[PDB]
């Protein structure tokens, strides 16, 4: 029978960090549907609105088996006298499970499926794909801010914000004879590099190298949380006009955004949790990014002509944060696709701006390091807001859930009978 | 409330009125505290009376019902398929009932210092209609108001997430189990993040699966202006159910008009068989 598991949510977090806003434990065989409707607000910013932030709300299903593996299987089999499922440990702070959208129990411990569940959802859909998994054991092992506000999500695809995989080959040797090459061996050489290149660029995931075989893999083959629903939108608001002697001609942008998310009814195969997370981000607009062709001094035929034959046939080009940013070290490199500068265009911000707080732009220079300079650098948004004890953004939503089960009943459980 | 005279009721009970009950939550509507978690049948040393046992169950049933639903005569009656006049149990007769949610709008500050700051203004037009009513005997008609906020605490945790080792009984939601064991005694500690292991209350098995607490991020519990429950519950059953008003003092600015004020025009109309204004002052 319909079980109304509705509840209110009073949220808040940083800019480019994934954070759990709601979770509902589900049992095997029940149908789950939710209607999440609220408003998203940003902290008051220092001037008028200039650029809308984009918001992504995700609802996933992670069965317990996925989390406890064989331990869970045995638990279900063993039944009533199964050994209790050991929760996970947390860090000394009421805001020490935040990322799990839950208050750490009185003993500072929490469900592993809440932890691993979360871990599994990031390492499978947010973490850059050449990147290493968050193999955190317990929330007491994750960085303070990773578990306060959540781990950093990736910046919105730019030219410099989506470099080619760093382990990307720029050459490939075939050991040849001293005065002869094997015309047939060469052929083969190319076949192998192909298979390698594909794995590097597109199939870094099993489920991915499979799909290109024309097959399919159940979220049960690779233990990946199942993405049930996804909502995306741009949050906006209005400016407030100051009207006293001193702040007459001054404004403060107020971002109030009504949003809604609908998770269509869903059949829960096994017992598990449904995680609903939010992520607020701004387009990667840096105040000092230059057009590659304008930042790289001598222009050769290969750079300026856009000869099809050329672009379509040479290795990825290794560039530095220096051919894209005005002061940046010659030393911080990344691999780009030849002619990439012709498939795109950076946003452009006049110098008059780079000295102004209140603009949701990237002031600072990138981060020499690949990873870090891709997964967004949240902190470079601290200067955009006024005062804030409600982080960068806060949310007030009413999670209207409806679960259809085969439950006892309230009176038949308390009725020894 | 067996108060004799208003000079006997607590200062604030008779200033602003007695405390009404919080809106039903999981922890805010515990099972009756006197609720039995077991029942013994005195058996023989090496035998039990199969027929006596049967009977044992019949009596406990009648007891359990009184405990959970029929704590009122008028109630133990109704389950007999009968009815009792408000005159049988001397209960005030509820003539009309209106319920609504009050709202308003925010006011935008616009000076140098409070530009980006707001103040919520709650103006709510309401109306209540008591349909014509035939007064059997002489008496008074009382009209009372009660303003409340949903019991949102800033530190309530999901039972399953606050109770450490999860057993098969807690996590599987086996119908057979939930539908057949005694009420579970829990503590303010399996629901609130600091709360004493010692403050108990009885919950229905699997109650954690029929419900969901509201959730408030820690960033909030340090913020005055939010009509939420900051403080921890009240170790005591009663007190921690009938709402803890005071935990709302911090939500308002300045106030010499309490927490809420009302301006209403009570349009009444009574049809009698009265003398008249001139025929009473007319000795005649």
């Amino acid at each position: 029978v319909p079980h109304d598991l509705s509840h209110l949510v009073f949220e808040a977090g940083k800019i480019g960090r994934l954070k759990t806003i709601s979770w509902t434990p589900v049992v095997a065989g029940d149908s789950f549907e939710c209607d999440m409707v609220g408003a998203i607000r940003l902290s008051p910013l220092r001037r008028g609105l200039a650029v809308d932030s984009r918001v992504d709300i995700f609802s996933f299903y992670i069965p317990h088996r996925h989390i406890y593996g064989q331990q869970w299987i045995n638990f279900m089999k063993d039944g009533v006298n199964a050994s209790p499922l050991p929760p996970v440990t947390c860090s000394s702070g009421w805001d020490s499970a935040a990322y799990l959208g839950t208050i750490p129990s009185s003993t500072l411990k929490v469900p592993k499926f809440l932890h691993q569940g979360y871990l599994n959802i990031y390492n499978n859909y947010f973490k850059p794909p050449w990147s290493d998994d968050l193999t955190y054991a317990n929330p007491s092992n994750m960085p303070s801010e990773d578990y306060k506000w959540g781990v950093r999500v990736a910046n919105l695809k730019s030219i410099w914000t989506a470099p080619l995989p760093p382990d990307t080959r720029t050459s490939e040797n075939m050991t040849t004879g001293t005065s002869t090459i094997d015309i047939m061996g060469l052929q083969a050489a190319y076949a192998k590099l192909h298979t390698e290149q594909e794995r590097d660029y597109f199939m870094t995931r099993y489920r991915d190298i499979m799909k290109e075989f024309g097959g399919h893999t159940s979220y049960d083959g690779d233990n990946r949380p199942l993405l049930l629903m996804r909502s995306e939108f741009w949050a906006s608001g209005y400016d407030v006009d100051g009207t006293d002697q001193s702040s007459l001609g001054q404004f403060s942008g107020r971002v109030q955004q009504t949003f809604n998310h609908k998770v269509p009814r869903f059949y829960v195969p096994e017992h598990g949790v449904i995680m609903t997370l939010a992520v607020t981000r701004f387009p990667p607009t840096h105040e000092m990014e230059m057009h590659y062709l304008v930042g790289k001094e001598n222009l050769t035929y290969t750079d300026i002509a856009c000869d099809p034959a050329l672009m379509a046939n040479l290795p990825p080009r290794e560039v530095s944060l220096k051919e894209f940013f005005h002061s940046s070290p010659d030393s911080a490199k990344f691999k780009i696709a030849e002619g990439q500068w012709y498939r795109t265009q950076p946003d452009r911000v006049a110098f008059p701006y780079n000295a102004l707080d209140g603009f949701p732009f990237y002031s600072a220079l990138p981060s020499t390091d690949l990873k870090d300079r891709v997964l967004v650098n949240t902190n470079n948004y601290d200067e955009i807001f006024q005062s804030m004890q409600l982080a960068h953004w806060n949310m007030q939503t009413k999670f209207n859930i409806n679960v259809y089960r085969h439950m006892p009943t309230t009176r038949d459980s308390i009725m020894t009978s | 409330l067996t108060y004799a005279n208003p000079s006997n009721m607590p200062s604030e009970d008779y200033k602003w009125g007695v405390r009404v009950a919080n809106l039903k939550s999981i922890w805010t509507a515990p099972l009756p505290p006197d609720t039995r978690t077991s029942e013994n049948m005195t058996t023989g040393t090496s035998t039990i009376d199969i027929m006596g046992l049967q009977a044992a169950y019949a009596k406990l049933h009648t007891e359990q019902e009184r405990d959970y639903f029929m704590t009122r005569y008028r109630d133990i009656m109704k389950e007999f398929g009968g009815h009792t006049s408000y005159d049988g149990d001397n209960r005030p007769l509820l003539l009309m009932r209106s319920e609504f949610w009050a709202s308003g709008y925010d006011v935008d500050g616009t000076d140098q210092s409070s530009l980006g700051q707001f103040s919520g203004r709650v103006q709510q037009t309401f109306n209540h209609k008591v349909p014509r009513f035939y007064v059997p005997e002489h008496g008074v008609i009382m009209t009372l108001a009660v303003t409340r906020f949903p019991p949102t605490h800033e530190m309530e945790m999901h039972y399953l997430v606050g109770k450490e080792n999860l057993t098969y009984t807690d996590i599987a939601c086996d119908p057979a189990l939930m539908a057949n064991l005694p009420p579970r005694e829990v503590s303010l500690k399996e629901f609130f993040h600091s709360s004493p292991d010692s403050a108990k209350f009885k919950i229905a098995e699997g109650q954690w699966y029929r419900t969901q607490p509201d959730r408030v991020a820690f960033p909030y519990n340090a913020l005055d202006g939010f009509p939420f429950y900051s403080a921890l519950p009240s170790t005591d059953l009663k007190d921690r159910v009938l709402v803890n008003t005071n935990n709302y003092d911090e939500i308002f600015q300045s106030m010499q008009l309490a927490h809420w004020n009302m301006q209403t025009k009570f349009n009444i109309n009574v049809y009698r068989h009265m003398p008249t204004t001139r025929d009473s002052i007319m000795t005649s």
């Binding site: 309230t410 308390i414 | 509507a29 009756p32 009184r66 639903f69 029929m70 704590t71």
Partner: peptide, 12 residues
């Protein structure tokens, strides 16, 4: 759905 809260009657 079905009832839940049981106090021992009606509580306003």
């Amino acid at each position: 759905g079905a009832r839940l809260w049981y106090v021992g009657g009606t509580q306003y």
